[PDB]
Amino acid sequence: WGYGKHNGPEHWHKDFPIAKGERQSPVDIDTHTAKYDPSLKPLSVSYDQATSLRILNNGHAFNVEFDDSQDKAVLKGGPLDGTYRLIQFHFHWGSLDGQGSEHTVDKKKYAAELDLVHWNTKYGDFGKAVQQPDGLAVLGIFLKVGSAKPGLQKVVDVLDSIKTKGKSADFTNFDPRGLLPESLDYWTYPGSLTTPPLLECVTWIVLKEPISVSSEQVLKFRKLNFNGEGEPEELMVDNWRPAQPLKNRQIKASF
Ligand SMILES: [Zn+2]
């Protein structure tokens, strides 16, 4: 599976039938139809004690891994029940600044989308969790192009080292707090993973307020390779999946 003309998202259903299930992601957030729900609690992001380990190019994106052996970086509150531990974060970007994000707002596409993946500690590990309806919590943040983001530069600067598929680099002392928007106002709905196995085990939390990245920042993202080292070069661009049908589901807003 991949993002080209022949193994792209329109083909995923052949191997991953849940590709056309009832709670697929991403979706288009219609802000006039989203429901303001007063019973929604504020998000609780505890990342001060986060331990980053490495960065790797898995052939579809680049993932920043964190030590989740203990409650060091956790997410709670909001529409969640229990404590969700950060496992990794990754992005989805386009070839141009006019597309990238997976989740869209009023049909608007952002330059890229940052997803923080967390799993429910009541299930013991990540693997058990993906087998559960309330198994994961993904925090989505849109990136728009304007001013640079100091907090993202450490990541940008290490991309040269993991150009191709399979490459990884030690990546310690990286603080995720530097990627959060000022406001934690959000939209929430029941969905799934956006890449196979598309397991419908996620509670999505999409932040209203986007973060800005400079053009050059984003540029470094478009220099990645889908391919392994020593193969023809496939630039890693447009690794995002198209919005899926809402199908009954309701999108709730915390504002
Ligand atoms: Zn993703």
From Swiss-Prot:
Additional facts recorded: Target of drugs used in treatments against glaucoma disorder and breast cancer.
Assigned keywords, A-Z: Acetylation, Cell membrane, Cytoplasm, Disease variant, Lyase, Membrane, Metal-binding, Osteopetrosis, Phosphoprotein, Zinc
Superkingdom: Eukaryota
Entry's Gene Ontology BP terms: angiotensin-activated signaling pathway; carbon dioxide transport; morphogenesis of an epithelium; neuron cellular homeostasis; positive regulation of cellular pH reduction; positive regulation of dipeptide transmembrane transport; positive regulation of synaptic transmission, GABAergic; regulation of chloride transport
GO CC entries: apical part of cell; cytoplasm; cytosol; extracellular exosome; myelin sheath; plasma membrane
Modified residues (Phosphoserine): 161, 168
Gene assigned in the entry: CA2
Residues with site note (Involved in the binding of some activators, including histamine and L-histidine): 88
GO molecular function: arylesterase activity; carbonate dehydratase activity; cyanamide hydratase activity; zinc ion binding
Effect of residue 194 to S/V: Reduced activity
Lineage, opening ranks: Eukaryota, Metazoa, Chordata, Craniata, Vertebrata
Keyword Lyase on entry: yes
InterPro entries: CA_dom, CA_dom_sf, Carbonic_anhydrase_a-class, Carbonic_anhydrase_a-class_CS
Main location: cytoplasm
Effect of residue 90 to C/D/E/N/Q: Strongly reduced CO(2) hydrase and p-nitrophenyl acetate esterase activities, impaired stability of zinc binding
Phenotype for residue 63 to L: Reduced activity
Secretion signal, residue range per the UniProt entry: none
UniProt name for this protein: Carbonic anhydrase 2
Effect upon mutating residue 138 to F/Y: Strongly impaired activity
Family membership: Belongs to the alpha-carbonic anhydrase family.
Positions annotated as active site in the UniProt record: 60 (proton donor/acceptor)
Variant or mutagenesis effect after changing residue 58 to V: Reduced activity
Cofactor(s) recorded in Swiss-Prot or TrEMBL: Zn(2+); Co(2+)
Impact upon substituting residue 138 to H: Impaired activity
